[PDB]
Amino acid sequence: MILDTDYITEDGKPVIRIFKKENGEFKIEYDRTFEPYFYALLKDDSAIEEVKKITAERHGTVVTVKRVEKVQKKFLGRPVEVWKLYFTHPQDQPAIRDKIREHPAVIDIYEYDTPFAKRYLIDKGLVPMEGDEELKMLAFAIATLYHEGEEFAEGPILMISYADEEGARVITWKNVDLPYVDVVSTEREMIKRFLRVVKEKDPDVLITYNGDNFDFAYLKKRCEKLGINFALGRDGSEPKIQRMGDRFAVEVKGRIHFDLYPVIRRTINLPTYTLEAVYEAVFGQPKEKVYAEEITTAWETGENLERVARYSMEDAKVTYELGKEFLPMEAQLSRLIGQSLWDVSRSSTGNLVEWFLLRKAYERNELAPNKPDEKELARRRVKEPERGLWENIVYLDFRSLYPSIIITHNVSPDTLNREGCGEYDVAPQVGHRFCKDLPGFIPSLLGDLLEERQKIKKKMKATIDPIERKLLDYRQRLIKILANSVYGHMGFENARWYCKECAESVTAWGREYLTMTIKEIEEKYGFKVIYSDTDGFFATIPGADAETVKKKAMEFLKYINAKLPGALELEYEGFYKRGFFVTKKKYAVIDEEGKITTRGLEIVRRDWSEIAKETQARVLEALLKDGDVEKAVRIVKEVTEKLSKYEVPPEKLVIHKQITRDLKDYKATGPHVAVAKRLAARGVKIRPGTVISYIVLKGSGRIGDRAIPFDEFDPTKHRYDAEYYIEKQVLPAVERILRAFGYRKEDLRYQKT
Numbered sequence: 001m002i003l004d005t006d007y008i009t010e011d012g013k014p015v016i017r018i019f020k021k022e023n024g025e026f027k028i029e030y031d032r033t034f035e036p037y038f039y040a041l042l043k044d045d046s047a048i049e050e051v052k053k054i055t056a057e058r059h060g061t062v063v064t065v066k067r068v069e070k071v072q073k074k075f076l077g078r079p080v081e082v083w084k085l086y087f088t089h090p091q092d093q094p095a096i097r098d099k100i101r102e103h104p105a106v107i108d109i110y111e112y113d114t115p116f117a118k119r120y121l122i123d124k125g126l127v128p129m130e131g132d133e134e135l136k137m138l139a140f141a142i143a144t145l146y147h148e149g150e151e152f153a154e155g156p157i158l159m160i161s162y163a164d165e166e167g168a169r170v171i172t173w174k175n176v177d178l179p180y181v182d183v184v185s186t187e188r189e190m191i192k193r194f195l196r197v198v199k200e201k202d203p204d205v206l207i208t209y210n211g212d213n214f215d216f217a218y219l220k221k222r223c224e225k226l227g228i229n230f231a232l233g234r235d236g237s238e239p240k241i242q243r244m245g246d247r248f249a250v251e252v253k254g255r256i257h258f259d260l261y262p263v264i265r266r267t268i269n270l271p272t273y274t275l276e277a278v279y280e281a282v283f284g285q286p287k288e289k290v291y292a293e294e295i296t297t298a299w300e301t302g303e304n305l306e307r308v309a310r311y312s313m314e315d316a317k318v319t320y321e322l323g324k325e326f327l328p329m330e331a332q333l334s335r336l337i338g339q340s341l342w343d344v345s346r347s348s349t350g351n352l353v354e355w356f357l358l359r360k361a362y363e364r365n366e367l368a369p370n371k372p373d374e375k376e377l378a379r380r381r382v383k384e385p386e387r388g389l390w391e392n393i394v395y396l397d398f399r400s401l402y403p404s405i406i407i408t409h410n411v412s413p414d415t416l417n418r419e420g421c422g423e424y425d426v427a428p429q430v431g432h433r434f435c436k437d438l439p440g441f442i443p444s445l446l447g448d449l450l451e452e453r454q455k456i457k458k459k460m461k462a463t464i465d466p467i468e469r470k471l472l473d474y475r476q477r478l479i480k481i482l483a484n485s486v487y488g489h490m491g492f493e494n495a496r497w498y499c500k501e502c503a504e505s506v507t508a509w510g511r512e513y514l515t516m517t518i519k520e521i522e523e524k525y526g527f528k529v530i531y532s533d534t535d536g537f538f539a540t541i542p543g544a545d546a547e548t549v550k551k552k553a554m555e556f557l558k559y560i561n562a563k564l565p566g567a568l569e570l571e572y573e574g575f576y577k578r579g580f581f582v583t584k585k586k587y588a589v590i591d592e593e594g595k596i597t598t599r600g601l602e603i604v605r606r607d608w609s610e611i612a613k614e615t616q617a618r619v620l621e622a623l624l625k626d627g628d629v630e631k632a633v634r635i636v637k638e639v640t641e642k643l644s645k646y647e648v649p650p651e652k653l654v655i656h657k658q659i660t661r662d663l664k665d666y667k668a669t670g671p672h673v674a675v676a677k678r679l680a681a682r683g684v685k686i687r688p689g690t691v692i693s694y695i696v697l698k699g700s701g702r703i704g705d706r707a708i709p710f711d712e713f714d715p716t717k718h719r720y721d722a723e724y725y726i727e728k729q730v731l732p733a734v735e736r737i738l739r740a741f742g743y744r745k746e747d748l749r750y751q752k753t
């Protein structure tokens, strides 16, 4: 299995290394035969002799064109003749490329800035992370001595924790008497011991959380300070930093440094990306945070070091588990995109699409178009649903609408307005013509992807190993997203295969096929379409029973799919006993077993009191389970009355809100801050991350001066602000739903007093 590739320089020539793990053993294969190159299109072939003599200087040495070769490749759908320019070293290209381009005889150059080791994987047809090999992983974390107003890593590393399948352990240089703690004399011995642990376990993957920007940088400075050869690379190298645009990344040669931070940042939306928040999100269970001042205070006083050690062990432990959780998906991605997990784990959707497409282009001998220049980048810059309760609803939607359009109409930059074609398809509204005589670059590669996905689904059934099936499932699911990412690519201003006409033709066709499908089902099968969005719609036959609606649905799908051209296909996605539709993106349905599914409506954040969430839930089931609007309305009115009668348990009024800044550097951004400041004033430790839990009390002033921490609420003396909970919690939770039935907030309570 291929893990990574790079190059070293040997007598001024590149030596590709391919890092592999085969039959449970690490191996480095060398290849000295591969040569840097890019392409030039010239006005007069004759000028090649001048172009061959162009030179530049890198460092203090002369850079020349090593050799040239006339080649034939596809550009804009047609065979073209271009000159392949070879160079001695990859770093020659940035030095000489602009001098070649600037030559008068040179029209343009192409494929001139692909990183050498990534070209290698492409041009040789190699794919990372392919095979049955099992990777050995090791997570690690550190805890440091922090003092505000100090330079970075001025203080020592206090603890290094690490976790793999054999458990988690902590290394530290003060005595902590715990079974999972290994005590050593000094920081230096700690670090050295950690090196021995890594070298002896020899993992293929090192997992961190934010190691790209903190852990390895800290370790680096401390190792400089202490004169330690931090030789974690399997070739004896030290971790190497790469500039990752705004910040940095770190490689450990011969291994994969999997930093979870960027992976998780893109996979899940959260307000905060602390390790504790991410571990609760993913695994559903809190993780306790020990703050930096407590760590430093513990080290200084010698007291509560066991608490520090446990936090350190847990950092490593949860980092490992998160790695176990996210890495297999990123590995399948890496295999499908054909680039290393190191690169893929840190790459935008954009970058990943381009790498896939560059490979396809190499595989089809198509000359890649160029990223736009800044002048070009500048150039590249409805229907409310039916109201009310519906019953016996079917959801029907297209299979891979945008890909399927692209395939069907052969939509591609290289097919657009092709001259002298005998057959073209014409985009609605926008009018762009796409030639059908020859399959386009994008349509052909998308057809292959959609096919492989169906082939993968076929094998998933023919398999029992649930693991193998999950890995097949990941690949299948990744292909679908890649297919849609290809569609987005055509509309993206920085894309190589940009094609604005392609993008706007695809969406135009989509609207035509959706709207036509809706027209047929209503006119020719008596359905009423309740709600539609882009690539699907809900409908019913008003007054029909569930079986009629299903049967007619299946008959319509047959009719429409026969009429639909090519790959366009509508499918039965589900049946729903009842539902309602507030607006685009906001709706609620219940299936025949009782399972409610909602979208755009449910009240989630912990900024909502339980009474709000509970009431909204009860409304939704009165609407969906009972089809009873008046009952939903009675529930609300009854809740708001109970509030006013001080009958709602105080535990259902509690609002929780996290402190984000120093209570000094705040925004007067709510009652949670006022409570925080009073606590601070009494001498309570408030930090970013402190959760404040409060109840709002009746009286005058902003809620702020009136709210109090839940643990101080005593019903025998305190009266909560029934009005606040009615008007600012309960009613806002239900108003959007019940507006869809003609009710305004004031219609859902008794009159104020």
Ligand SMILES: [Mg+2]
Residues within 6 Å of the ligand: 140, 141, 142, 143, 215, 315
């Ligand atoms: Mg750490």
Ligand SMILES: [Mg+2]
Residues within 6 Å of the ligand: 198, 199, 200, 201, 202, 203, 234
């Ligand atoms: Mg080793």
Ligand SMILES: [Mg+2]
Residues within 6 Å of the ligand: 210, 211, 212, 213, 214, 215, 216, 217, 218, 250
């Ligand atoms: Mg770092």
Ligand SMILES: [Mg+2]
Residues within 6 Å of the ligand: 233, 235, 237, 253
């Ligand atoms: Mg090296």
Ligand SMILES: [Mg+2]
Residues within 6 Å of the ligand: 257, 258, 259, 260, 261, 262, 263, 342, 345, 346
């Ligand atoms: Mg990473």
Ligand SMILES: [Mg+2]
Residues within 6 Å of the ligand: 331, 332, 333, 335, 336, 474, 475, 478
């Ligand atoms: Mg895969």
Ligand SMILES: [Mg+2]
Residues within 6 Å of the ligand: 122, 337, 338, 339, 355, 356, 358, 359
């Ligand atoms: Mg690739």
Ligand SMILES: [Mg+2]
Residues within 6 Å of the ligand: 397, 398, 399, 400, 571
């Ligand atoms: Mg579908």
Ligand SMILES: [Mg+2]
Residues within 6 Å of the ligand: 611, 614, 615, 616, 618, 639
């Ligand atoms: Mg309630």
Ligand code: NA
Residues within 6 Å of the ligand: 122, 125, 126, 338, 359, 363
């Ligand atoms: Na390939």
Ligand code: NA
Residues within 6 Å of the ligand: 422, 423
């Ligand atoms: Na024809």
